[PDB]
Paper text:
Pif1 is a DNA helicase belonging to family SF1B of Superfamily 1 (SF1), which unwinds dsDNA with 5′ to 3′ directionality. Pif1 is involved in DNA repair and is necessary for the maintenance of mitochondrial and nuclear genomes integrity, in the regulation of telomerase activity and in the replication fork progression. We were able to crystallize the helicase core of Pif1 from the thermophilic bacteria Deferribacter desulfuricans and Sulfurihydrogenibium sp., which are moderate thermophilic bacteria, living at an average temperature of 65 °C. Pif1 from these bacteria are named DdPif1 and SsPif1, respectively. The helicase core of Pif1 from thermophilic bacteria is very similar to other bacterial Pif1 structures already solved. The HC contains the features of previously described SF1B helicases: two RecA-like domains 1A and 2A containing insertions 1B and 2B, respectively.
DdPif1 apo crystallized in spacegroup C2221 with one molecule in the asymmetric unit and DdPif1 in the complex with the nucleotide analogue AMPPNP crystallized in spacegroup P21212 with two molecules in the asymmetric unit. Only DdPif1 was solved in two different states, apo and in complex with the ATP analogue AMPPNP. Structural changes upon nucleotide binding are moderate in the absence of ssDNA, as already observed for BsPif1 and ToPif1. The main difference is the folding of the N-terminal part of DdPif1 (residues 1-20). This N-terminal part is not visible in the DdPif1 structure and may be disordered. Since we observed that the N-terminal part is not visible in the DdPif1 apo structure and contributes to nucleotide binding, we hypothesized that it could flexible. Therefore, we analysed the structural changes of DdPif1 apo in solution by small-angles X-ray scattering (SAXS). The molecular weight of DdPif1, estimated from I, Porod volume, and Volume of correlation (Vc) is 50 kD, which is consistent with a monomer of DdPif1 in solution. Thus, the DdPif1-apo structure was modelled by flexible fitting with DADIMODO by introducing flexibility in the N-terminal tail (residues 1-20) and the linker between 1A and 2A domains. Therefore, in the absence of a nucleotide, the N-terminal may be unstructured and becomes folded upon nucleotide binding.
Numbering used by the authors: 20 to 144, 156 to 411
The structure:
Amino acid sequence: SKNLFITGKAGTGKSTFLKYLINELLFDAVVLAPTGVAAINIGGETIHSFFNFPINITPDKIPDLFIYDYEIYKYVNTIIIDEISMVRADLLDCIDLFLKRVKNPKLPFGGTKMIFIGDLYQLPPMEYESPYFFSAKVFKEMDMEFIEFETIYRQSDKLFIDILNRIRNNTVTDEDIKIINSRVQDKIDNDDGYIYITTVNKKAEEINNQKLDKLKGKLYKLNGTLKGNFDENSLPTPKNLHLKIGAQVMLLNNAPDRMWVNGTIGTITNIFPDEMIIELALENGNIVEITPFKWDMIKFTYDKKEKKMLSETIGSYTQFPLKLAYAITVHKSQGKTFHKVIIDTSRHFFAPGQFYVALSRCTSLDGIILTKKITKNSIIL
Ligand SMILES: [Mg+2]
């Protein structure tokens, strides 16, 4: 029974379709994701919580890993892992190794049927050949179906989408190494409307708190409420939300009236905390009214009464779906596009391919700025 890899985009569809899947059709399946935020966005459990993995988990640490509940996995026969590109090679082998301990040890993933959901950009054809998931030892042991389901479109408006797919296979050409330098500015208009892309959370938090500190409006300090058991390492936005008028922010939910999507940029025009309203102006002019938003933290549990897997809500987090959007790391911007992005090379290191993902996060390459030149062998993925 083959497993499945599919290439699906983080739309509202995916999230609710997965709920229908594992509630109305499948009763022996769960939905995992690599980080906490990624897990709450789609209503799943993080891989680490589902397996009670310590934070520094590694394949050799597995044989002697303590197991809280040997029984839950006996009832789990299909595992869906979303945002598969954010899973490390060694982590996927830990999952395989783990399943083999609790489930049938002679088969890959203990015999569990595995479904992987990734992005159009991250795709495949004793020591690891790369940190990316397709370099897991367990890919050797098994065969998969490949569905490029959401391949009928992409996340860029311009015609030279081709350039992204041209440096994919190291075929980045001299003829098209320029224009790629044409975007090398010297940043005369600092910075309005551009989000900086970085590699280190430290320096992204530094640029964010730079811009906020200079804005001369009063400082507002919005406090979200945590109920029950909610991991404070998976807050989509800080519990101490610091904001001012004029702040350049990002939206962290998908509007139901399709007025915005996770990643949309805006500017705060008013803050009214007694009424629990933040007003912001979008890029296309429209002013919106943002009220707080409740995220649910799930833990899968087997209901012995009904003989099906249930998503049991173990906590909640209520805060305004916003965070400072002057800067973000390449990792924390996984499902977002943006329109005005700054990729500084002078600061921030971008190993070729970390640099590619960066480029993969601007609607158009006209809304891009760089610092230094770009050669043909510095794009050798
Ligand atoms: Mg099933």
